[PDB]
Design a protein around this nucleic acid. Structure first.
Ligand SMILES: Nc1ncnc2c1ncn2[C@@H]1O[C@H](COP(=O)(O)OP(=O)(O)O)[C@@H](O)[C@H]1O
Ligand code: BEF
Ligand SMILES: [Mg+2]
Lengths: 1623, 178
DNA sequence: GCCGGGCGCC
DNA sequence: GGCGCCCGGC
């Protein structure tokens, strides 16, 4: 991959709008800098237009737009459809409707793209319906990139593709084609269809013809397409909306005359003067209306010229507004809005008729569920903004009073309570637009009636948006009425003062005992079938209690507003109505009355006006609250029922004497006018506390012992219910007291003993679950602090500020409690971190929410001087840190029993909670705190480190220019430090929380972050590895689109140079083809091939940045020369540097090359060939010689070592610092525990490098041991790698896995592959070697022998049943029996003589049967493979005629010495003395094997060489051969393939034949293709019918995805967005 | 007695007059999905009263996911209106509630084996098959799924009053068990 | 120059 | 479960 491919991939997958925007911007810049890359970009981005996901499709369209805008415009002078012929009737009568097309027809998808285009182009004329009959697909049998490219318009090929894709059956592809044409035409249309050589006059004709041809297809799609979305209240037709936009796009450039043809065709589609009278009208009319919308929108210049066009578009609009279909009405209403100010100039008659019909479309009620009225009222609001329309209203009034404006406006009132929320919102917005007009127009309808209607629409509305709009409308109405005269407002609202005051103060109740509002108070809109009646009944269970509280507080706001304007002598009715409510028996009535007084005092001009309420308010906080509330009577009745149940339990099972116990009162306190004898919770306390034990005294022995085990539980039930009642009453007391205190604070009274005010407000902040009340209280305390500080009464102010600071730290989930975590050291707290647990967590969340809002409002209120006006907050957030971290930690800071640790933690939490809202003038204070926080980050205690990490995450998140320079200068360079673990742990925690909080804002700084994060994925501490890998996985994704980001504006000069220093490193790491050439300094004695030079550049790249990798080049490409030249160059460079500087880290040290034993000679030979000036020491031989060599190793450049010698002599090999440590044939250390691997991993070395032929056999999970050697812990410790990757992947392979497990496995393996890929270097043989002749891999078949058949049937008939039944077991021993049987079977398959040793099951019968044959066991007639090998030897001329050209020289491979000896004896000596052969297996010492291979390779006298696969199989160059025969085979295909490939490699100059000797039957069948061509590169019920526990949710097993967001339609089809893109 | 349960799902049924050419509903409307080889009906969805409506070829409709009776009626009327818009002769002929599913979180955990073993005639326990006890009432014909965590969800009620009745009738029973 | 052995692995 | 091979011995 390259940067471009990843950047283009970002468009599909991306975090946010911002990342995709950056990707498209950087694609545009990449095109600008390299203009010729235009089509290489478009061929990459265009295929995303067909993508399944809307957002990907839209982003690909935007990417094309931006890319095209940077391309040069086309002007060479610097079969088409004709638009006139379009007969609308035929295209709808005939032709193919375009829908969400059927399943894929794969026979057509298989076509070459150009012939696919040709076939679809043939079918296009049929599908349009020009044939005069409905085209059927059967008539057309089905049976350098298409988007790729000065003689013609460059995008001609792309547009030819998209114009035919525009009719594809799939809806996604039609959307994609429409958007692609939209962008391409929008930018480059003026050059469309031009061609070189022709004159400008003729090129104008060609351009006109081409754009007519395009608009023909766009109209065809407009009328043919019927796909629609009915999710929302108004149906959306996405494809023909997009095609409307594309028609607008072509309309910009198309000649003025052709606009009239387009207009005539759209007008015909809308009027439908000749089409069939059917339901087909709907789609065609809607298409015509969107077309007319874009025609009028983008070509205003045409409408002004002549009257016929404007007359016809308004004719279409007028017809559509009267249409039966609601969607036609909606789009018609929308059609005229863009052109209103253009239309008002038109002849009076058209304007009068339009006003008449748009008003009359509201006179009749539409269908209950028709949402189209909203659009019509938007049209009406826009029309009534222009004075000409109002003058037309005056003209209409002058001849018919019934159509006057002030008497027409009431037609909007019945729609206020409309069933569809969009209609209610549209009505409120339209009425607001009417209010903001000249007072003479509106003074007739602004009256009591509309005020009452809006106020009752402020109470009963549940939807938030309708609520807020209703309250804004109320504000404008009441303010505008007041502006004329306050007496006028008083007179209008006089008659409704009392009913709406009652509705404002109404109680709320409890879920199953609602308190319904009197329906008589609600006035009908008309002046007097889904009803919004749940809210009127006060049904707290169907409408959540928070909604009712919100309605009450909003009604309080409105009533407080209107009370302000009425002159105070006239407020007497309102005053008495609220004062009678402050003492109401309901808690909610008192709360609502307090809020009404609060709002009246608040938005009144001066508190002295509102002061008259002060004593009624103050008495609420001063005096003892009532012991009962009628709202809470349910709780006390439940208490009474439970206590009566306890008494009954005493009477029945305690068997107490009846009549010596209290008869509880029938009526409960708080019931309406209940007398003083009513039951009360105090009596419940008396029962459960005193009477209970009294009855226990009264109960006789023999009853107590059996009665108590029920009476105890009954008592606990009663006492918990009593506590619940008390808690509810206390909550109401707190709420009412808080509301009263807020009302007092609004009136600017400051009592000389403010503790009751402060206590009430704090109790509300600390407790109020309902968000609205808590926010009100928070704003109250925030204002109260300002009042105290301005008055100079600083004492209470500092007390409340300290209490707020205390509250802000209460959420333990965010602010740790120091005394628990104080001892924790060297634990990354970000990883590690009864019902009372959840209850306390919830209460902590509530109180922190309240205090955090209070401090936010404090910051916003005080502005730039908060730290000056409120010193105690400065003390809080500055004194603990300067004490603790100016010098070293005072020893008291570690003590859990000293509060100072919690003071430090609270200081950090206060900084974190204040600084994202702190005014920008106070950021120098936070930056003055940063030096102390970054020192606390290096602190030893885990909790300080964790809090400091979060604090710096937030500080950098809100101070990017200044925080990030401090972080990069004074934190990150310490992260490499090995001496002290706290530094690295702190730094990685900062990066973790920083990546978490900043999200996409880190984009300028990911280069600073990535390299010191990549450096720590191999850290020794486990938690550092976990967090580093987690961060890197989500931080590398942003690297591809970093390079184009402009520099961070404020960043220091040195840091930019540091960025540039390693931007190149990361860019090379991700895409190795960018790696710089490395000029090998030393005089290597052989010239490198091209790919070898590039691989050496890669190895030198790794050596330069201290990474370590796997040179996984395919077998025989010449890895030895690459390795030798890099090793020699490294030795040369470090010797030069040590002479130059004396630095110990570059001092001369020996390198080590570990290889299998047989290659010890090979490596020395290769070194002596290519780099004779390096001394090489062969640390191989008998132990005495190695002991003699024991100390000499330091004094040589390269040490060669066998794996087994490394294992046995690790005690001396481990003692030396080894510089480079090359594992030749590194796949032998795949086992994680095998002894040679446990030995090799102990070696210290500066650079490590594995060489392999094949890295894995079956699965990528085999890589773990290799990377645990190269980079300790890079993929984690074994358990961490297994549970992170291996277990998910393995589990996902089976059909047992659920789809979640399957996709988890796919994600996990992709994560591993992306993590490991940059370090492997893999280049296949055939890609880079062209001189090397091919190889062929034949089979050769020989029939089984008699004895083999006999012994097979015997083994299966005697032991086969037991083995096959053992296959039903899964334990180690069972599959061990299977493996043993298979291994036994193969030995039999080769020859019977291998297995038929004395004492075998078949021995004696075998002896007598051999006597029956009259021959010995060893007769080769019983061993077929020997009988086959002679055939291949002879026909290749080996041993024939014992010219001497000798066309073939062979290798023959065996897995085991017995088979090799059998072959060497029987075939090579008994049958064919003519053959000359050489020996290579374990019988010859490792030092002789190199010599014997050299003898075979140089001397053509010998004909064949015999190999044991274990010995000769790996790496040992034997190029001289040209055929290989495998008489015996391994299970593992990779060893088999490598045994072939060590014959076919560089320097070999003959076509190679590989023969496998195969017996016809048996296990040979299971090994035929392995090596041939595999390179290994709750509430749940059934809805349809009620039953418990469904096992399968049939109709929803897909999950239905999820319902798409409407913002896709709202933001994409916005006409104001479309016109913005013109220029 | 006790603390009232919430509702979570109301399933309502409507009979449309006309036979539906069901595949064309999937072809024309985006908010619809049809896979005859998996399930036999087209699962429409609508956003505002968030619901899914299984529309069968026989004209039957089953609307799910509303949380109020009037909300379910409104949603079903909107679905009938949508099917009328596609061109079929569909009428809102009939409407019945068929299942109101309640749910509540009781504070204390349940000694579930006690309920499984004391009550016989209306209690059943299946520990690994489904972790909750199945309680089958007789008078209100409500099935209660009782979990060890204190979760109770009630089903089979025709109207919410039966849900409240069943909860306040089972609460003084399982109150005897932790 | 030969031998058989115990450790190691599939 | 086998068989391989770096060993110590004659
Ligand atoms: N520059 C080179 N020029 C000529 N031959 C080369 C060159 N590099 C490698 N070779 C040849 O290719 C073979 C080396 O392959 P090798 O490094 O041994 O792969 P492996 O070690 O994996 O078996 C040798 O025949 C060698 O002569
Ligand atoms: F060196 Be390779 F694995 F043949
Ligand atoms: Mg090699």
């Amino acid at each position: 991959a390259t940067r471009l491919d990843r950047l283009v991939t970002i468009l599909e997958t991306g975090s946010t709008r911002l990342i995709r925007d950056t990707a498209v911007n950087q694609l545009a810049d990449w095109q600008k800098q390299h203009p010729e890359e235009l089509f290489n970009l478009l061929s990459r981005v265009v295929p995303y237009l067909r993508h399944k996901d809307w957002e990907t499709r839209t982003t690909a369209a935007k990417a094309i737009g931006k890319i095209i805008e940077n391309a040069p415009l086309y002007d060479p002078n610097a079969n088409f459809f004709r638009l006139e012929s379009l007969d609308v009737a035929t295209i709808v009568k005939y032709g193919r409707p375009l829908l969400r097309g059927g399943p894929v027809d794969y026979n057509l998808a298989a076509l070459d793209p150009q012939k696919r285009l040709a076939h679809l182009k043939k079918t296009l004329n049929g599908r349009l319906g020009l044939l005069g009959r409905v085209f059927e697909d059967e008539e057309m049998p089905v049976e350098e990139i298409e988007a790729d490219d000065g003689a013609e318009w460059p995008f001609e090929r792309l547009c030819e593709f998209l114009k035919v894709d525009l009719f594809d059956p799939q809806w996604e592809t039609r959307h994609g084609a429409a958007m692609g044409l939209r962008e391409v035409i929008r930018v480059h249309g003026a050059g469309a269809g031009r061609r070189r050589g022709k004159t400008r006059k003729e090129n104008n004709d060609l351009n006109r013809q081409w754009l007519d041809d395009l608009a023909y297809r766009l109209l065809c799609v407009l009328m043919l397409d019927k796909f629609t979305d009915y999710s929302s209240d108004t149906s959306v037709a996405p494809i023909r909306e997009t095609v409307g936009q594309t028609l607008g796009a072509v309309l910009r450039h198309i000649s003025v005359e052709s606009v009239h043809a387009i207009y005539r065709l759209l007008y015909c589609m809308v009027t439908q003067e000749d089409l069939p009278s059917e339901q087909n009208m709907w789609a065609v009319c809607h298409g015509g209306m969107v077309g007319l919308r874009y025609v009028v929108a983008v070509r205003k210049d045409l409408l002004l010229q002549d009257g016929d066009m404007i007359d016809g578009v308004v004719r279409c609009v007028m017809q559509g507004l009267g249409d039966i279909d609601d969607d036609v009405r909606s789009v018609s209403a929308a059609t005229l809005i863009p052109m209103a100010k253009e239309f008002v100039m038109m002849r009076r008659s058209a304007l009068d008729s339009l006003i008449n019909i748009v008003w009359e479309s509201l006179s009749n009620l539409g269908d209950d569920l028709s949402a189209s009225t909203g659009k019509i009222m938007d049209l009406l609001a826009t029309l009534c903004s222009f004075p000409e329309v109002l003058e037309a209203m005056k003209v209409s009034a002058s001849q018919d009073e019934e159509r006057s404006f002030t008497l027409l406006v009431p037609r909007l009132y019945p729609f206020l309570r409309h069933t569809i929320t969009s209609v209610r919102l549209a009505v409120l917005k339209a009425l607001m637009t009417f209010a903001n007009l000249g007072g003479e127009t509106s003074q007739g309808w602004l009256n009591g009636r509309i005020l009452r209607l809006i106020f009752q629409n402020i109470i009963v509305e549940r939807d938030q948006d309708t609520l807020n709009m209703s309250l804004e409308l109320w504000t404008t109405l009441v303010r505008r009425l007041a502006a004329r005269d306050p007496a006028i407002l008083a007179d209008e609202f006089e008659a409704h003062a009392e009913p709406m005051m009652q509705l404002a103060l109404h109680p709320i109740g409890v879920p199953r005992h609602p308190i319904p509002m009197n329906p008589a108070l609600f006035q009908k809109p008309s002046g007097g079938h889904d009803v919004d009646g749940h809210m009127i009944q006060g049904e707290v269970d169907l409408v959540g209690v928070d909604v009712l509280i919100r309605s009450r507080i909003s009604a309080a706001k409105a009533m407080g507003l209107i009370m302000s304007f009425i002159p105070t002598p006239r407020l007497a009715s309102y005053d008495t109505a609220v004062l009678q409510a402050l003492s109401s028996p309901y808690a909610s009535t008192q709360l609502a009355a307090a809020m009404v007084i609060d709002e009246y005092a608040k938005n009144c001009s001066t508190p002295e006006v509102a002061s008259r309420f002060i004593e009624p308010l103050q008495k609420i906080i001063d005096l003892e609250r009532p012991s009962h509330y009628r709202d809470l009577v349910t709780y006390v009745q439940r208490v009474r029922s439970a206590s009566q149940q306890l008494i009954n339990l005493f009477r029945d099972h305690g068997k107490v004497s009846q009549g010596k116990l209290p008869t509880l009162a029938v009526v409960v306190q708080g019931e309406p006018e209940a007398g003083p004898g009513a039951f009360s919770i105090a009596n419940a306390e008396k029962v459960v506390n005193e009477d209970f034990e009294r009855l226990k005294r009264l109960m006789a022995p023999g009853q107590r012992l059996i009665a108590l085990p029920q009476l105890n539980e009954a008592r606990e039930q009663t006492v918990e219910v009593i506590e619940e009642a008390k808690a509810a009453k206390e909550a109401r007391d707190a709420r009412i007291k808080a509301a009263a205190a807020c009302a007092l604070v609004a009136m600017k009274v400051l009592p000389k003993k403010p503790s009751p005010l402060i206590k009430a407000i704090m109790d509300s902040i600390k407790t109020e679950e309902n968000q609205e009340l808590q926010s009100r209280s928070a704003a109250t305390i925030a204002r109260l602090v300002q009042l105290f500080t301005e008055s100079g009464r600083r004492g209470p102010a500092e007390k409340v500020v300290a209490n707020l600071v205390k509250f802000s730290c209460v959420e333990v989930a965010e602010t740790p409690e120091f005394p628990i975590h104080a001892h924790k050291t060297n634990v990354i707290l970000s990883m590690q971190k009864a019902v009372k647990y959840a209850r306390e967590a919830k209460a902590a969340r509530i109180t922190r929410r309240g205090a955090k809002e209070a401090l936010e409002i404090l910051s916003k209120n005080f502005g730039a001087e908060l730290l000056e006006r409120v010193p105690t907050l400065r003390t809080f957030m500055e004194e603990p840190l300067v004490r603790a971290f100016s010098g070293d930690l005072p020893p008291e800071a570690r003590d859990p029993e000293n509060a100072f640790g919690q003071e430090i933690v609270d200081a950090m939490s206060v900084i974190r909670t204040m600084t994202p809202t702190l005014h920008p003038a106070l950021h120098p204070f936070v930056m003055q705190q940063v030096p102390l926080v970054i020192k606390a980050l290096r602190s030893d205690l885990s909790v300080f480190r964790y809090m400091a990490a979060k604090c710096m995450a937030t500080i950098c998140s809100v101070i990017t220019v200044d925080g990030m320079t401090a972080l990069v200068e004074k934190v990150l360079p310490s992260i490499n430090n090995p001496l002290d673990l706290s530094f690295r742990q702190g730094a990685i925690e900062v990066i973790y929380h920083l990546i978490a909080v900043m999200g996409d804002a880190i984009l300028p700084y990911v280069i600073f972050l990535i390299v010191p994060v990549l450096g720590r994925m191999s850290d020794s501490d486990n938690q550092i590895r976990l967090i580093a890998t987690t961060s890197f996985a989500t931080l590398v994704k942003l690297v591809p689109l970093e390079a184009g980001i402009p520099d961070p504006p404020g960043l220091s000069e040195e840091l930019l140079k540091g960025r540039d220093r390693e931007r190149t490193f990361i860019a090379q790491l991700l895409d190795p083809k960018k790696i710089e050439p490395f000029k090998i300094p030393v005089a290597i004695k052989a010239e490198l091939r091209s790919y070898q030079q590039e691989g050496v550049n890669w190895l030198a790249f790794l050596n330069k940045y201290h990474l370590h990798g796997i040179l996984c080049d395919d077998m025989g490409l010449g890895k030895t020369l690459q390795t030798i030249c890099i090793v020699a160059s490294d030795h040369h460079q470090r010797a030069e540097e040590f002479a130059r500087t004396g630095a110990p880290e570059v001092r001369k040290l020996p390198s080590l090359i570990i290889c299998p034993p047989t290659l010890s000679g090979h490596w020395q030979q290769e070194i002596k060939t290519y780099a004779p000036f390096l001394t090489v020491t062969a640390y191989v031989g008998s132990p005495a010689e190695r002991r003699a060599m024991k100390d000499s190793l330091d004094k040589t450049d390269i040490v060669i070592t066998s794996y087994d010698v490394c294992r046995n002599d690790i005690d001396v090999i481990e003692k030396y610092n080894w510089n480079y440590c090359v594992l030749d044939e590194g796949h032998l250390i795949k086992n994680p525990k095998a002894k040679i691997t446990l030995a090799v991993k102990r070696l210290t070395s500066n650079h490590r490098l594995i060489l392999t032929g094949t890295p894995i056999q079956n699965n990528v999970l085999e890589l773990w041991s290799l990377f645990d050697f190269l980079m300790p812990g890079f993929l984690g410790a074994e358990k961490v790698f297994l549970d992170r990757f291996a277990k998910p992947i393995a589990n996902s392979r089976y059909s047992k896995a659920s789809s979640k497990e399957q996709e988890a496995g796919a994600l996990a393996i992709e994560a591993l592959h992306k993590q490991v890929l940059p370090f492997l270097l893999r280049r296949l043989k055939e890609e880079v070697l062209n001189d090397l002749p091919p190889k062929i891999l034949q089979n050769y078949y020989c029939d089984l022998s008699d004895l083999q058949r006999k012994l097979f049937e015997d083994f299966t008939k005697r032991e086969g049943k037991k083995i096959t039944e053992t296959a039903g077991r899964d334990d180690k021993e069972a599959k061990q029996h299977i493996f043993q049987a298979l291994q036994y079977m193969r030995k039999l398959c080769n020859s019977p003589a291998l297995v038929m040793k004395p004492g075998h099951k078949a021995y004696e019968d075998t002896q007598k049967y051999l006597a029956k044959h009259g021959t010995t066991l060893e007769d080769p007639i019983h061993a077929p493979k020997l009988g086959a090998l002679r055939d291949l030897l002879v026909d290749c001329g080996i041993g024939v005629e014992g010219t001497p050209i000798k066309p073939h020289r062979a290798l023959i491979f065996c897995q085991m010495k017995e088979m090799l000896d059998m072959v060497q004896n029987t075939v090579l000596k008994q049958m064919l003395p003519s053959v000359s052969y050489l020996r290579l297996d374990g019988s010859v010492e490792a030092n002789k094997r190199q010599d014997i291979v050299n003898k075979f390779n140089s001397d053509p006298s010998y004909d064949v060489l015999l190999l044991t696969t274990s010995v000769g199989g790996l790496g040992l160059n034997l190029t001289g051969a040209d055929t290989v025969i495998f008489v015996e085979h391994d299970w593992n295909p990779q060893k088999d393939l490598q045994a072939m490939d060590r014959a076919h490699r560089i320097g070999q100059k003959k076509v190679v034949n590989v023969y496998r000797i195969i017996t016809r039957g048996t296990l040979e069948e299971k090994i035929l293709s392995l090596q041939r061509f595999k390179i290994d590169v709750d509430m749940v019920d059934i809805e349809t019918g009620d039953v418990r526990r469904p096992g399968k949710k049939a109709a929803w097993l897909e999950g239905l995805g999820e319902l798409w967001d409407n913002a896709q339609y709202e933001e994409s089809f916005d006409l104001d967005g479309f016109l913005k893109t013109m220029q | 007695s006790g603390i009232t349960p919430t509702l979570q799902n109301i399933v309502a049924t409507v009979n449309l007059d006309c036979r539906l050419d069901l595949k064309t509903i999937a072809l024309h409307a985006r908010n619809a999905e049809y896979n005859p080889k998996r399930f036999a009906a087209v699962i429409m969805r609508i956003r505002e009263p968030k619901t899914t409506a299984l529309i069968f070829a026989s004209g039957k409709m089953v609307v799910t996911g509303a949380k109020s009776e009037d909300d379910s009626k409104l949603a079903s009327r909107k679905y009938a209106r949508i099917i009328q818009k596609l061109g079929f002769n569909a009428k809102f002929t009939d409407f019945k509630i068929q299942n109101i599913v309640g749910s509540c979180d009781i504070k204390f955990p349940i000694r579930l084996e006690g309920l499984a073993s004391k009550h016989h005639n209306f209690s059943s326990y299946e520990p690994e098959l489904f972790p909750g006890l199945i309680y089958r009432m007789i008078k209100p014909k409500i099935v209660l799924l009782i979990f060890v965590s204190g979760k109770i969800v009630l089903t089979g009620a025709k109207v919410r009053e039966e849900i409240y009745q069943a909860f306040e009738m089972i609460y003084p029973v399982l109150q005897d068990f932790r």
